[PDB]
Design an enzyme around this catalytic site. Structure first.
Site, PDB file in Angstrom:
ATOM      1  N   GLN G  56      74.911  48.325  40.619  1.00  0.00           N
ATOM      2  CA  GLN G  56      74.437  49.528  41.296  1.00  0.00           C
ATOM      3  C   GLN G  56      75.561  50.546  41.387  1.00  0.00           C
ATOM      4  O   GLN G  56      76.741  50.201  41.255  1.00  0.00           O
ATOM      5  CB  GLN G  56      73.845  49.237  42.672  1.00  0.00           C
ATOM      6  CG  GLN G  56      74.414  48.071  43.422  1.00  0.00           C
ATOM      7  CD  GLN G  56      73.592  47.781  44.667  1.00  0.00           C
ATOM      8  OE1 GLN G  56      73.576  48.569  45.620  1.00  0.00           O
ATOM      9  NE2 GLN G  56      72.888  46.655  44.655  1.00  0.00           N
TER      10      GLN G  56
HETATM   11  N1  LIG Z   1      59.977  41.018  32.305  1.00  0.00           N
HETATM   12  C1  LIG Z   1      61.346  40.650  32.495  1.00  0.00           C
HETATM   13  N2  LIG Z   1      61.817  40.753  33.698  1.00  0.00           N
HETATM   14  C2  LIG Z   1      63.134  40.348  33.656  1.00  0.00           C
HETATM   15  C3  LIG Z   1      63.851  39.922  32.565  1.00  0.00           C
HETATM   16  N3  LIG Z   1      65.241  39.587  32.980  1.00  0.00           N
HETATM   17  C4  LIG Z   1      65.274  39.834  34.267  1.00  0.00           C
HETATM   18  N4  LIG Z   1      63.966  40.318  34.731  1.00  0.00           N
HETATM   19  C5  LIG Z   1      63.668  40.687  36.156  1.00  0.00           C
HETATM   20  O1  LIG Z   1      64.390  41.860  36.499  1.00  0.00           O
HETATM   21  C6  LIG Z   1      64.901  41.803  37.801  1.00  0.00           C
HETATM   22  C7  LIG Z   1      66.385  42.008  37.944  1.00  0.00           C
HETATM   23  O2  LIG Z   1      67.100  40.970  37.219  1.00  0.00           O
HETATM   24  P1  LIG Z   1      68.537  40.583  37.541  1.00  0.00           P
HETATM   25  O3  LIG Z   1      68.937  39.506  36.605  1.00  0.00           O
HETATM   26  O4  LIG Z   1      68.655  40.325  39.038  1.00  0.00           O
HETATM   27  O5  LIG Z   1      69.288  41.927  37.277  1.00  0.00           O
HETATM   28  P2  LIG Z   1      70.865  42.312  37.434  1.00  0.00           P
HETATM   29  O6  LIG Z   1      71.303  43.137  36.307  1.00  0.00           O
HETATM   30  O7  LIG Z   1      71.652  41.077  37.755  1.00  0.00           O
HETATM   31  N5  LIG Z   1      70.827  43.312  38.784  1.00  0.00           N
HETATM   32  P3  LIG Z   1      72.241  43.648  39.700  1.00  0.00           P
HETATM   33  O8  LIG Z   1      73.320  44.274  38.873  1.00  0.00           O
HETATM   34  O9  LIG Z   1      71.710  44.575  40.766  1.00  0.00           O
HETATM   35  O10 LIG Z   1      72.723  42.335  40.295  1.00  0.00           O
HETATM   36  C8  LIG Z   1      64.433  40.416  38.364  1.00  0.00           C
HETATM   37  O11 LIG Z   1      63.275  40.557  39.218  1.00  0.00           O
HETATM   38  C9  LIG Z   1      64.114  39.603  37.103  1.00  0.00           C
HETATM   39  O12 LIG Z   1      63.153  38.605  37.284  1.00  0.00           O
HETATM   40  C10 LIG Z   1      63.229  39.842  31.237  1.00  0.00           C
HETATM   41  O13 LIG Z   1      63.705  39.500  30.217  1.00  0.00           O
HETATM   42  N6  LIG Z   1      61.890  40.249  31.285  1.00  0.00           N
END
Ligand SMILES: Nc1nc2c(ncn2[C@@H]2O[C@H](COP(=O)(O)OP(=O)(O)NP(=O)(O)O)[C@@H](O)[C@H]2O)c(=O)[nH]1
Ligand SMILES: Nc1nc2c(ncn2[C@@H]2O[C@H](COP(=O)(O)OP(=O)(O)NP(=O)(O)O)[C@@H](O)[C@H]2O)c(=O)[nH]1
Ligand SMILES: Nc1nc2c(ncn2[C@@H]2O[C@H](COP(=O)(O)OP(=O)(O)NP(=O)(O)O)[C@@H](O)[C@H]2O)c(=O)[nH]1
Ligand SMILES: Nc1nc2c(ncn2[C@@H]2O[C@H](COP(=O)(O)OP(=O)(O)NP(=O)(O)O)[C@@H](O)[C@H]2O)c(=O)[nH]1
Ligand SMILES: [Mg+2]
Ligand SMILES: [Mg+2]
Ligand SMILES: [Mg+2]
Ligand SMILES: [Mg+2]
Lengths: 51, 165, 51, 165, 51, 51, 165, 165
Positions: G56
């Protein structure tokens, strides 16, 4: 027999980190370490006192 | 400056009893010292690191391991033990030759003076050869570890002698 | 006799600060230290590893 | 990952000779090992800390003091010592009971196969009880620390076996 | 703002290795560390005094 | 506010002895320490990696 | 050699989800990462210390604090987020100027390709300006952390690209 | 034994000036203490670790972070600050409830007695509620950090009160 108890007492104190420089001298003396080894231990020990 | 003292002598002389008699009331709850005891004592508002080394035969050879940086040696001798006063002289003669103790001041405690049969301070001094000591700042005091007599005087002499140097 | 040279060996390495934890286990085993002390030594040694 | 290896076995097996043969040419300038030797050895661009523990009688009881965090044991046995193979078995059975070695893989070096009087790998395996080894990933190879043969084949199998795990 | 400078001051001292156990207490209090973590840090700090 | 939980998360790792050299870099950057103090910190930190 | 990889990209791309998908089955039990996650991953028997940094706004400026000694960068990009692809580019361009990342290779993951509205790898590639990369080894793949697809391919390319160097 | 002392009190009381007046001459070259100062001090040849904690409002809540293993608390109060004596009471009442200060002795310093508008030690004691202290070894002294008056008497009492215990 009496020297063994003495040895263990001295060795226990050293390994627990107390008055390590004096204890080192008695340990090398009781166990008759050779002069080379003795001096190697007594130096690292000195290099230890700096802290 | 914080001086460090060594309490030496033959087994039985009363070295441990003396150590705890100093800086603490007294309770000769004592057993043969196979190793050593170390305690910090404050006299005339000063500080000494005092080492009490066991004196039985097999460990006496390791006394010299502690001579480094010694300011004073309190040498304890059993005033009632006439059969072994010669051995005390031997050990004493040997230690004084030690280069690391050249500037150390010597204080002899003719201890166990509370005993009727205890020999006098003069007899001991002559028997130990003290009168011959050259280049040596010394003094002999009669003491009692159990009754606690003669200690304050000895400490006074030791404290003042070294404050000079 | 042989065990004496062995101990002089394990001790030397320990005092020079090499592989201290292993050396402490053989030193405490050879001299038959009492459990309570052996454990006291083998904990400070474990805490030592955190550095 | 940097694995740790122990070379164990009876006195005169060739343990020390093997160690330096590994990660260095070979000069058996050697004397009975009254203690141990530790050297870092690199194989297939990999890294190991290898311990060579003296094997004479009076000090074998202290081998277990070194078992913590062991990845593999290279057990060296003298192929011409028919009188003592029973003893190598007892020491082997005894260490495989050790909880700290449960996951360590075992490789046996039937050393001195350059000598005509050497026993066969099969004779040895049976006399050591290897055929009945359960829950163990093991193997035996013939070697000659002096001539430098067989070690490479042995190390190959060892490295591959643990690269899996 | 006075609290920030304060925090910065206590953090500096801690990272230079002086009076680390006390600095650890004020740091976790100022930043309101959850209880679990604070206790985790205060223990290592205690294991650290042995040396 | 988001940086506060961040700082706390990073400080925790550092104080627990994990990846200290990297944590040191982010802590001093987040709290904007002066070049001098930051360099004093990241050197003592380096002299630590030798162990 | 043990390489360390940094997983970067805006918030909500799937960075955290992808990390555990590698070296473990999969359970998107995930919450925003206000800090970071570090895990050891093994591919073709190889070993890697993988760092997943939260993306973020307010914490992104601290990404450069971890660039030291980085072998490769897995840059995750949300395929459906058309409004913020331009920002992803800003971040990617910033880090490529960084002197400590000069020799690190770039692997872009067009994530969430399981969503009917995900843009195409070619669309993303041009928008990010990858067709113009100079002195850089890079490739883009489409993945789905949730469905667990396209990941194996990407890793194959990454591991082999660095196995060369 | 080496005792540790804490110097607490509201901002502007003269805590820092007192610290350096102790163990050195005197140079009030001082600025508001946004944090703390620590120094080793020797009185009657004795050793003390003495802390000086800043007293402005927002950092007062952190004084308790330093309460562990405290032998004495020198509470400094501005004798001329009549608007804030009630606040000096609040803080004192609060800290005395702390279980970690149970066995600590209290020594209040009615500072700035060089000023004509300095209230008497008796008025202060009454306004602070000292007379109502139960299970508390305490005493109050008038002082002048700048003129160096009153400190010796204060230190004597402190030193002798704790030598007892
Ligand atoms: N449809 C879909 N949703 C996905 C995929 N990978 C992650 N998501 C969804 O997207 C959201 C965020 O994923 P996350 O792994 O937490 O993201 P991040 O980059 O770590 N976010 P941050 O930097 O805020 O920690 C989650 O609700 C997850 O289930 C994918 O390949 N397909
Ligand atoms: N009557 C009397 N007994 C004493 C005196 N000083 C010591 N003793 C006794 O002598 C015995 C041995 O005393 P101790 O202090 O243990 O002697 P030590 O010189 O420390 N022996 P070691 O060197 O073996 O530890 C004890 O029973 C003790 O009570 C003294 O002044 N008078
Ligand atoms: N013929 C032959 N001799 C060998 C071989 N490997 C070692 N030797 C010889 O066996 C003897 C002892 O070898 P060495 O490696 O010291 O044995 P060790 O197992 O370390 N003995 P210890 O446990 O007592 O330290 C030496 O004379 C050495 O040259 C081999 O493969 N063939
Ligand atoms: N006239 C007079 N001024 C004093 C006396 N003691 C301190 N002062 C003055 O009061 C001011 C504050 O003193 P200082 O020791 O910094 O106070 P402090 O309690 O440490 N303040 P803080 O907690 O904010 O750091 C200085 O300007 C100092 O010269 C005193 O006895 N008489
Ligand atoms: Mg005794
Ligand atoms: Mg050998
Ligand atoms: Mg996340
Ligand atoms: Mg001040």
């Amino acid at each position: 027999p009496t020297e063994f108890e003495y040895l263990r007492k001295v060795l226990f104190e050293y390994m627990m980190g107390r008055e390590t420089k004096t204890m080192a001298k008695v340990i090398t003396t009781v166990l008759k370490f050779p002069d080379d080894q003795t001096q190697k231990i007594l130096e690292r020990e000195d290099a230890r006192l700096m802290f | 400056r914080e001086m460090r003292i060594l309490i030496l002598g033959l087994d039985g002389a009363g070295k441990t009893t003396i150590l705890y008699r100093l800086q603490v009331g007294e309770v000769v709850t004592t057993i043969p010292t196979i190793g050593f005891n170390v305690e910090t004592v404050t006299y005339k508002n000063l500080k000494f690191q005092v080492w009490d080394l066991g004196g039985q035969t097999s460990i006496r050879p390791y006394w010299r391991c502690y001579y480094s940086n010694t300011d004073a040696v309190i040498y304890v001798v059993d005033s009632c033990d006439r059969d072994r006063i010669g051995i005390s002289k031997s050990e004493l003669v040997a230690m004084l030759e030690e280069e690391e103790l050249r500037k150390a001041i010597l204080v002899v405690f003719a201890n166990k003076q509370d005993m009727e049969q205890a020999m006098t301070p003069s007899e001991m001094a002559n028997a130990l050869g003290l009168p011959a000591l050259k280049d040596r700042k010394w003094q002999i005091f009669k003491t009692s570890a159990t009754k606690g007599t003669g200690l304050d005087e000895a400490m006074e002499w030791l404290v003042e002698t070294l404050k000079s140097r």
